[PDB]
Amino acid sequence: MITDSLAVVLQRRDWENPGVTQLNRLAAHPPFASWRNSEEARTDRPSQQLRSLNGEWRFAWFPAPEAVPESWLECDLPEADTVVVPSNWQMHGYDAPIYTNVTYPITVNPPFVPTENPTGCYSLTFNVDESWLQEGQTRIIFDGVNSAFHLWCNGRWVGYGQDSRLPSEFDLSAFLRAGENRLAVMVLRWSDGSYLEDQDMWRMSGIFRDVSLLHKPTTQISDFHVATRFNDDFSRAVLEAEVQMCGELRDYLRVTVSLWQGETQVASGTAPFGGEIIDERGGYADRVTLRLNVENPKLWSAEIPNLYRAVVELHTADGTLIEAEACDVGFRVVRIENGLLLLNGKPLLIRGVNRHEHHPLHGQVMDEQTMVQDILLMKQNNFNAVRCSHYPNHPLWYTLCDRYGLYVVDEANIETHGMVPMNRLTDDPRWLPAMSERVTRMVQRDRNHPSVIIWSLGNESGHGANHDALYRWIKSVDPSRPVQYEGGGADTTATDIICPMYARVDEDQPFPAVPKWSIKKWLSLPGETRPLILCEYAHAMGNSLGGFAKYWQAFRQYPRLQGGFVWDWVDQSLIKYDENGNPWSAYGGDFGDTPNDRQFCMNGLVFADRTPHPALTEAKHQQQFFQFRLSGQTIEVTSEYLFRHSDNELLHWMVALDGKPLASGEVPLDVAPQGKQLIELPELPQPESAGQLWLTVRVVQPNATAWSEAGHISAWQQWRLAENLSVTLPAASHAIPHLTTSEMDFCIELGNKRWQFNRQSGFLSQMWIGDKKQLLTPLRDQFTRAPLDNDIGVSEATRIDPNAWVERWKAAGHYQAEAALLQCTADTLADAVLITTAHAWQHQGKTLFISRKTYRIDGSGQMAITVDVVVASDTPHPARIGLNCQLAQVAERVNWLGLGPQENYPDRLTAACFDRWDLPLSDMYTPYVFPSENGLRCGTRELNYGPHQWRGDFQFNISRYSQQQLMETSHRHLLHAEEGTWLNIDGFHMGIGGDDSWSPSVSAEFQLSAGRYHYQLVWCQ
Amino acid sequence: DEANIETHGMVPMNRLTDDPRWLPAMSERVTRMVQRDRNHPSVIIWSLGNESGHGANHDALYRWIKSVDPSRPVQYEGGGADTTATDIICPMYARVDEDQPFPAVPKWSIKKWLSLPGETRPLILCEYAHAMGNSLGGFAKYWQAFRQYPRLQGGFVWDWVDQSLIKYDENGNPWSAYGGDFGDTPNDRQFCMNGLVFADRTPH
Amino acid sequence: MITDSLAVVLQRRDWENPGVTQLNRLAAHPPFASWRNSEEARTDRPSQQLRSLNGEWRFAWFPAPEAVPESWLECDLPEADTVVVPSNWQMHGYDAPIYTNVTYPITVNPPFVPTENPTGCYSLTFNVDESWLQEGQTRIIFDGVNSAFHLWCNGRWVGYGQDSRLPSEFDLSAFLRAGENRLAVMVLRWSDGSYLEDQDMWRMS
Ligand SMILES: OC[C@H]1O[C@@H](SCCc2ccccc2)[C@H](O)[C@@H](O)[C@H]1O
Ligand SMILES: OC[C@H]1O[C@@H](SCCc2ccccc2)[C@H](O)[C@@H](O)[C@H]1O
Ligand SMILES: [Mg+2]
Ligand SMILES: [Mg+2]
Ligand SMILES: [Mg+2]
Ligand SMILES: [Mg+2]
Ligand code: NA
Ligand code: NA
Ligand code: NA
Ligand code: NA
Structure with missing residues (x-):
């Protein structure tokens, strides 16, 4: 058999020819099991005619297709290992996975791929019973093979396939023999189809979905x-x-x-x-x-x-x-009438998230248990929609979204982000056959699923005439679903829905020929009638989702803004092992891949092992299905469900005075879809004790559902009730702190407590309780933070992005401005000691900040600190204005009265509740894989840590890692806990942004732009 | 200018053109025609082919042409001459006053066809007045209607020249042959000769 | 050259595969003449860079593609006649033209055509001057070939084409040699493209 040999099959080079996307591949269709019993088909019992070939296969890696020996077609190689299929071979250490966002991982020369094309040779020996060969058709189904593959059965060439994300089926009934059969699959890493598969993900390869045999009559x-x-x-x-x-x-x-x-x-x-x-x-x-x-x-x-x-x-x-x-x-029924996307006659509000198929250990191989884990976490966090970004998923995913209830946007496997211009392939009719296969075979596979409500033509491929043709093809074969497509400016003729990526709520972004208008402006453009659903918004890269409440205020206010899909669900981090076998989370660059896009692979609301980021709670609160309004004693509860009555819901309310509870109650909710219910509270307690009174309501689900446990909290809201200001005088103690002035320091002692102020630096350098030093580092002003991923953007050491916040802070010298003591005075009052200092932060002769402080140690041992900061108007606005010190204490639990329990920032604090919170110190650190500023708690009135107590109205974070260490460390596993405890107490903190992570996205009301700042603290024991 | 797509013999007529496995083969025939001929000023209308039913591949290729070349209308007859894949109602052999109510593809009279509810397109007969032999009776009725109604903008007579071939009998004398005269079987006999002129271009 | 042989090229059976409509065919474009003088381009004088290959070709008829001998790729057959190109071979008495209106002239089993697929083997021997081979691109343009064809140049397989009514262009600059060149074209009467070509006319090839 000369024509079955590798020299003949590979000479055509089908993987460098966009006109050949398959050879001898059967037609696409919905998933079949071929039950021969109709009761077995009804109850969905497993068919004996569908046989899985998953399990142990033989595998050999080759650097090129030409390096595969001819003997591989007949018998197994001696050097062949035994791998489990489905798998990616980069997850088994055969070459490296590549992470790249925009740039193709190969040389851009379509349709040609490199001659160094890594080749995986799979083989399986298996037995077919003779009853399958006597009658009927036996086909093999490859549910996904990345990227292209030739198939041999018993040494005879069967066929060829591309499109890694859709199933390839081949008739084997003329190839199988009775008894023992061998099946040789030669998988290539790069093909002509790789130019259409430039999604922002890890580039892996292999037989990564299930392989099965189907016997049909x-x-x-x-x-x-x-x-x-x-x-x-x-x-x-x-x-x-x-x-x-x-x-x-x-x-x-x-x-x-x-x-x-x-x-x-x-x-x-x-x-x-x-x-x-x-x-x-x-x-x-x-x-x-x-x-x-x-x-x-x-x-x-x-x-x-x-x-x-x-x-x-x-x-x-x-x-x-x-x-x-x-x-x-x-x-x-899904239809668009009058500019609104309707489901069953009701306008949808899409509480969506983008989801890649990613597992940190197995790469892009998905099993059922991880899919069920994702769907439960999505519905428990008030998501109702998933966008398959950016390819058709595993077929079980659509079944589970049918069952649990999630709207699905099914997306064709077309992305040519790396092309210059972006529509170079999609405006070429020579690529129309390759693009059409990717669209038509998706629709033929998935058109019967009720969870699929919207077709998507792909992602980030510009706008060419091939999109318009494939748009109209789908509208012809399947009128029951809208078609959306983002490329070319999100409002082209190839989309039923305006679907911008990362368009802001109020700010226009006038890019040439593809402007991102603000979403409120975009709806009102002349001649524009379509609904707007953001296909990607609120880029969740690390410590992000600042300003997420601004989107959900706009989604609820405008009818034609029907929500969007958060980018994205899970971090695409992989697991490496350092030297002791300890696993650690790796991002782009950690496998030797070059060039790569570093940590832009990790944009998830959950970590790769599906534990939540703190931004997931903000998403849960803004997407909650009950809205609350307080008017006096009355709470109205508005349902945002479209179809169901609130038959598994009770409202639990509490009233607390500075964290301690005063009254509570439970009311059952009986609210219609889109209805209201007035809840009259009882006569709330009116304590004459000082403090703010807070009303908290929660919607609790008493009964378990398919997706939630009993007692699941689905919605909450907090309000301030009446406040009693404290007019009580402090208790006039009879002791007086004693001031001692040397030329090195001011020393103030009162009882066993002692404070020392270095007269050359001007800062409080040491505090004593008895003979225990309480500080390791003096209490100094801090105007910087370890930069977030939103602060960094796309800037690195080779390409400086001068608009990014970290590059403006570095160029202004905020990270290297030195404090210079202007003056320091110490005075004894009638009942206190008053220390007054003034510092200037200068960089190259330019004064950036001036801080003027006042330390007042009274007879009760309390130290009242008042800080007045002036910021130069021409320097970029500082990330924070506050104090830091390294405490010598390492206590085990942190207790605070403020917003919590989870970390929150000034533009991400709507989900936090004001209460008395108590957490271990490890919960005060958020382990982002790329280390940054984290763990901040805003709105804090009291902080307790060990013997110390701080009071005021401040933001704090408290951890074992300095801001300097968090800035200079690239991975979280390389962080070492320092001696003692680093405390930052901020009067003021900049927002974190997160409209996108490649341009400045902190809105102006969360920048520290006022020029003059004042805050007050009380340190005591 | 008309794409080289006709699947008249298929049962049903759109068996290939409603199949997406044939969309790459059909697209090549359309896209390479437009790329060859888009600069000619005499080409004023693109045609998606002839007698191929109406499948989803026609709608996709209709919209492809409207994207790459907005300067020319696209017409297509198959599927009842007024589908979404045509800018022009283009019936074949629709009569002036008489309806022909065929199931699922009726040929209305051209005066009635313009006035159907929701119908706004112009009507240009892509084939009319079948000139088979001694024919074109009632040709004046079409041209009375073309001049009277504004949205009836004429048509294309079927057809220009007889498709007869030359054979030689026994003395070397040439004679005009039609279908069947070459041993071809089955054949459609004299339906190849529908011209207004003979094959040597002398007039009927 | 095993992969250039008829046993390897015809085993794929590209004419029974609607997913393969061409192999190595260049992109479609408006008609080019490649004038190297702009005044000659303006007055539409004939270009010296556009060379017609019309004229006398060698032709052999075969009842099936499998009946073509392997020696045809290297030298002319002894039984080859001399025909004028362009022509239909049914007008020269090699098989019969078929007139049918609606019914396909083959058995309707798409994408398969009959194994009795009449095959016309064309060949042309021609000289290329060395100035064309020193620089630039030399392509061959087939303005129409009914129905499908494989192309060889100097025994090496160049490409494949369908769609009888549009031009097929192939880059020959890696195939031509200085002096004498041979160009073998194997034209098939029926292909998968014949299912899209059921016009009411004489079926010729
Ligand atoms: O899947 C769509 C993607 O869009 C790009 S924009 C391009 C900005 C950029 C370019 C190069 C490196 C990093 C960011 C985002 O970076 C991704 O996180 C994801 O949203
Ligand atoms: O090119 C479009 C063609 O339509 C067919 S209708 C089918 C009626 C028919 C069927 C079989 C044999 C004879 C006539 C005409 O016969 C042709 O002359 C020409 O107008
Ligand atoms: Mg290919
Ligand atoms: Mg991208
Ligand atoms: Mg073919
Ligand atoms: Mg016809
Ligand atoms: Na809305
Ligand atoms: Na990303
Ligand atoms: Na008129
Ligand atoms: Na005719």
């Missing part, structure tokens, strides 16, 4: 479509089922479509083959259309995922079953 169901059509009030539905057969037509062949609600049968129909006349030549003799009438169907939504079970039986006229197929059916 000779006359078989080749395709089936379900479509639901409704009347005006959704009380009568028509399930239109279109079944296609292949094989030889017989007049005794029948098709029965039965519809089941659990165990009871709702509708049924039967028909012989032969469609209606559609043109001059007749109709389809090999197709049927069955129309089933359903009276009062239970409608599918993400709130209530009502599913039916449709069973399609191919059988003869006397009644013997040939084949059964089945799919879950949800009755739902």
